[PDB]
Design an enzyme around this catalytic site. Structure first.
Site, short mmCIF file in Angstrom:
data_model
loop_
_atom_site.label_atom_id
_atom_site.label_comp_id
_atom_site.label_asym_id
_atom_site.label_seq_id
_atom_site.Cartn_x
_atom_site.Cartn_y
_atom_site.Cartn_z
N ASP A 1 0.91 -1.12 0.43
CA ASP A 1 -0.08 0.10 0.07
C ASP A 1 1.06 1.32 0.17
O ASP A 1 1.13 1.54 0.51
CB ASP A 1 -1.42 0.07 1.08
CG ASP A 1 -2.01 1.50 1.18
OD1 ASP A 1 -1.59 2.32 0.59
OD2 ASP A 1 -2.27 1.09 2.49
N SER B 1 -0.59 15.91 -12.33
CA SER B 1 -0.77 14.98 -13.46
C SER B 1 -0.66 16.77 -14.29
O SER B 1 -1.46 17.14 -13.13
CB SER B 1 -1.89 14.37 -13.28
OG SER B 1 -2.27 14.09 -14.91
#
Length: 330
Positions: A35, A199
């Site tokens: 994770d 992004s």
């Protein structure tokens, strides 16, 4: 040193991925959920409340000659899906794919919430976010990667998750046969303890690319792709009959649909998520309403590049003095 381990979907939907991990002496092999959105290595154990164990493999520290109680240490964690676990702490030897760390904090669960009990395939979590998020008190502990870093050939790990197929986590090296083209690296902020990056935009299907900054986290422990409501609405508007359902808890779409791809930007580069990766199947057994793999982050407080996005790429988690993320197509 290096390590290399295969990671395998837990079910036919790729809801999560499990990777075998050796703990203790002699080794006890548990299947852990790696994770990159958390920083605790915790396991089902001989200390876990018996009614909260249902098929998981447990770590028994009393059977490990290298286990030592970390005296006074406790831990307690809550995840974004509302699940939680807590317990006490041992140090022990932990190996992943041939890479061994001695003295790793192994957090032994005394209590786990129902969603953990109900998932017999996940024996615990191995956190790979920054150690500043580790919950052990009163002495915070380091992640497996932080402990291994100095010994690694290069201070990196990579995630290569499969679509409906196994993939690989590598530690200490970049497998140049595992991706196509070049790896594009992008800046990371560690201020929230996550692999947080920006992004450069998105496209829906064959549509034009929209240049817009989207700050979010690379999180292998989250199944879906969570993005701003504007972006998610633009995606699902291209699917006939798709709608946001308050009763189901997100966007659903007709199971008869063919879904468009979704592209996200990494600098000047582009990662394409095929439409099929966005199909999470019937909302309930036999339903013709299917659950979408792109969902709004509006209720979260952060955008999350979970497995739906990451499995479309070869992803480098670069833990150099100034960390960065790299993405390549594959």
């Amino acid at each position: 040193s290096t390590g290399s381990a295969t990671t395998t979907p837990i079910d036919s939907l790729d809801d999560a991925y499990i990777t075998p991990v050796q703990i203790g002496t002699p080794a006890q092999t548990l299947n852990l959920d790696f994770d990159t959105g958390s920083s605790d290595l915790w396991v089902f154990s001989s200390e876990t409340t018996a009614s909260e164990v249902d098929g998981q493999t447990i770590y028994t520290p009393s059977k490990s000659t290298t286990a030592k109680l970390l005296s006074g240490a406790t831990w307690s964690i809550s995840y974004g899906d509302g699940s939680s676990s807590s317990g006490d702490v041992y140090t022990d030897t932990v190996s992943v794919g041939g890479l061994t760390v001695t003295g790793q904090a192994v957090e032994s669960a005394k209590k786990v919430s129902s969603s953990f009990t109900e998932d017999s395939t996940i024996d615990g979590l191995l956190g790979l976010a920054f150690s500043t998020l580790n919950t052990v008190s009163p002495t915070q502990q380091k992640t497996f990667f932080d402990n291994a870093k100095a010994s690694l050939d290069s201070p990196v790990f990579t995630a290569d998750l499969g679509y409906h197929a196994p993939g690989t986590y590598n530690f200490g090296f970049i497998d140049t046969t595992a991706y196509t083209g070049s790896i594009t690296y992008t800046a990371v902020s560690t201020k929230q303890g996550f692999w947080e990056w920006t992004s450069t935009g998105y496209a829906v299907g064959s549509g034009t690319f929209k240049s817009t900054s989207i700050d979010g986290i690379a999180d292998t422990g989250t199944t879906l792709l969570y993005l701003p409501a504007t972006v998610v609405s633009a995606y699902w508007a291209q699917v006939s009959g798709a709608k946001s359902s308050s009763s189901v808890g997100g966007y659903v779409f007709p199971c008869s649909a063919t879904l468009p791809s979704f592209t996200f930007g990494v600098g000047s580069a582009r990662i394409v998520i095929p439409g099929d990766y966005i199909d999470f199947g019937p909302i309930s057994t036999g339903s013709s309403s299917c659950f979408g793999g792109i969902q709004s982050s509006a209720g979260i407080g952060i955008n999350i590049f979970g497995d739906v996005a990451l499995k479309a790429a070869f992803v480098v988690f670069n833990g150099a003095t100034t960390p960065t993320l790299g993405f390549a197509s594959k």
